[PDB]
Assembly symmetry: D2
Amino acid sequence: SNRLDGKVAIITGGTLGIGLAIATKFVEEGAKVMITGRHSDVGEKAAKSVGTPDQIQFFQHDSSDEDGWTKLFDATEKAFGPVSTLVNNAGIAVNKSVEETTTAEWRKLLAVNLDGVFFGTRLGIHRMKNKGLGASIINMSSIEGFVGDPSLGAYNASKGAVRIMSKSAALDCALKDYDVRVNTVHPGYIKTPLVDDLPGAEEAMSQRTKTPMGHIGEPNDIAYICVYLASNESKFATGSEFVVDGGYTAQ
Amino acid sequence: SNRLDGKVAIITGGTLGIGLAIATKFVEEGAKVMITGRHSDVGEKAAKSVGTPDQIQFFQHDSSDEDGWTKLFDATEKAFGPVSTLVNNAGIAVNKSVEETTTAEWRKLLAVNLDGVFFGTRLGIHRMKNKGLGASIINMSSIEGFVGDPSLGAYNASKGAVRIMSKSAALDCALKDYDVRVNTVHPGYIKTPLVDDLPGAEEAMSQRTKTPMGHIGEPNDIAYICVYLASNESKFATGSEFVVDGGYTAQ
Amino acid sequence: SNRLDGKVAIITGGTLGIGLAIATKFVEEGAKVMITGRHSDVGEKAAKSVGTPDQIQFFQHDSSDEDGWTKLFDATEKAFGPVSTLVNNAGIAVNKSVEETTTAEWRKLLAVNLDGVFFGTRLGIHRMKNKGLGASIINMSSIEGFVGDPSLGAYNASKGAVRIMSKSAALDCALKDYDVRVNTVHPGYIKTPLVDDLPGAEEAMSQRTKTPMGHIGEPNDIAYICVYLASNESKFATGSEFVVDGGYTAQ
Amino acid sequence: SNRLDGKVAIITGGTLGIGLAIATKFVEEGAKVMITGRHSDVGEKAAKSVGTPDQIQFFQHDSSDEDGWTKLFDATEKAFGPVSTLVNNAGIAVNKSVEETTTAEWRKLLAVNLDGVFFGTRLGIHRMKNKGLGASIINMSSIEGFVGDPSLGAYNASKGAVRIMSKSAALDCALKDYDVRVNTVHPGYIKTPLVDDLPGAEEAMSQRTKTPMGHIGEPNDIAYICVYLASNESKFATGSEFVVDGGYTAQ
Ligand SMILES: [Mg+2]
Ligand SMILES: [Mg+2]
Ligand SMILES: [Mg+2]
Ligand SMILES: [Mg+2]
Ligand SMILES: [Mg+2]
Ligand SMILES: [Mg+2]
Ligand SMILES: [Mg+2]
Ligand SMILES: [Mg+2]
Ligand SMILES: [Mg+2]
Ligand SMILES: [Mg+2]
Ligand SMILES: [Mg+2]
Ligand SMILES: [Mg+2]
């Protein structure tokens, strides 16, 4: 329905799962997309699977890599013109309690999940402000940004940080009339090939004491809320949290 | 883009402002709509202004009127077939502190804003469960369901009640596999003819200490999040709060 | 330790369970207390069990009874001097989903849990403002004011209302320099003789998927946070939610 | 009133302002206290100002220094016996928007405000679990852990992280019956000599659009909620947020 007419989007971690579904729906709604990922083998195949290079390209990048962020925005503008939309979706997890998190685990996870979002959000504001683009920064901030999980200590830290840092950025962009919105999306458990690779994971996640709907979601569940937030339909939404979680946080 | 293909929606307080914009966008996305309002003069004109009777009709009703709710669902099903979608949007305000709220003011506001939402949500679950409709109940729950305002005491009570009652309903519908989702929408300040009728109101609401964007929203800002929530795009969203407020609650 | 030196407190539903523990600790900290309850047999015994009439008295009252509230404040002032402290603790529950809540059940529960808190808060502001009392209104607002429960629909409505209405009152009292604070306390599951009377209830409430500590609390757990909020120790706390829940809402 | 009978507390950033008031009230309530700070000149004077070495000592430490944390717990146990209580209060601020935060500023602030809290919380769980101490970890998590401020981007990130990381730790300690509680305290604006050193700061913070009480708090306002959380009075409170903010976040 051309809901993203003329938009130019960067999606980090766009080569798999949630990020790939966001990229797919963004292209279907008329956006030009640059997806990122660490593995050129995966990324080259992923871009080609979604569309032609006039619609979607791949840029190899680890979101923790500060200087690569500059190269990524330049490559996207060279391909598609000025960037309007950034989805900070790249993330990793550590399955440790706070008590059992090694400092190396802590720093590695924060480098991707927190520094990556900071670097992308900071650079995005510089590059997308004051251009009449209807710019939108969408930060993936998890149900683990609202509630704790005893075995996700560092992940919880990262997602709580993204949640409130995003409000700061939203406010500064609003008060300065930058034409940049910043919002967070908080997925509950989502079925991906990686969940499928973990025996018993989907069944545990689908128990009513975890997800009240009694099943987990699917990548397009997160793609559709991202289309809304990237579109001009959400021009009055900034500094807000959007939860799509099968009821996980309602109980 | 036919995002509400085959849906049949009731929108309370659908004859003006936010409700009328929700009705307009619902019809544009392929839903059949029954709007309600207290004033037959307003409602007859409003339905005709949006579309033909095959698309949209009006039913006169005060949401505080329990027995009229049954008549409303029957009229909608007679016109359009089984109801899939309920937007509990009808509301009133009292400009009083808790200290200065009369008991008559308290009961009148709660009858519309809280009993109306309860009556609609209860009846909606009975009528829309277990039919494969992809049913969705959307309760208007305000930024005043998140933060207090010293001059909106009864309104705050009503909107806090809608916020958490809606989570209860969401959970019961999820746990029982009813195929009914329940979510809340929380508008910030929105420009309507009624705001326009109050000298200085929009300017006060647009101060940066109130709305960081420095302007208020427009009825379509609430219509678009309602289209998402009424659509099957939001099939994994239940028990969630969706804020569209220009940054009001982010600071 | 005389933490409530000179305070004069009304505790609704003060004759049993949580309310009786709040009354007991208030008297131990030097407050003069008027407890209320519906049953003169229970209330007369309860006051005598805590202390002598110079320390604590009983006033028979249903918190839903608007005109009795005036009589209650007058009786307390006659016994002990001007009221400084109000704990709106009286409440009832209905074990019904929203879907299965009768209108009679809905209205009865809201009359106690919501009208009672409104009547007490409104009257308290009138009677306790501008007297240098360090006045404090503490509204019992439940974990069910934060999360839904599929079988507590009306209770959830009432507790969400108390949560946000209390912020309105807090703000108006702060902005007008009334020397009245308003805060909410949100108990998780608490062991009382009434829980003991329900076979299997404590075991269900103690499951790790409900209360992560693996046991439920005890009335003094709520008494101690109420002493803090009634005391001048909390003179900068207003409009805040205080949760004491064994981790229920943290997951 | 000996509310912290037998407790042994570490307070980071305990040599000034809020931390020094927490230390002062902890000693008055019968706790043995080790305060930390970066400056031996300040810390030696601060410990002596509160009490004698049998009551309170100073240990020089930057909370960002991982290996110093081990030395700090050993010194405290050598002086006073096993540590029961940790207040992670040390923090710094950067007055920059996300847009204008340098990477050096970002990393320095996160090293103190986030790594320091992680290091202290992790080590505290190892050292204070399974000893019958009634152990309590209290993490300073700010009103800036709830709302954004356009000029506190990195600070907001750090305080959001502390808020949700603390819930993870609370849950793991509860589920494993470690006899360790973890909670967060969220001060609003508090008058300290450092605020006094910034011309116009207190007046800006006291505007009704910032702090509804129309004045800022005082260090003892944070000390008293910390006494409650360190005491066995709060034995059912874990994973909770305690806000003391003059109404800042209620509007
Ligand atoms: Mg890849
Ligand atoms: Mg559970
Ligand atoms: Mg918000
Ligand atoms: Mg939960
Ligand atoms: Mg009308
Ligand atoms: Mg939710
Ligand atoms: Mg009684
Ligand atoms: Mg608050
Ligand atoms: Mg120092
Ligand atoms: Mg303001
Ligand atoms: Mg909690
Ligand atoms: Mg606010």
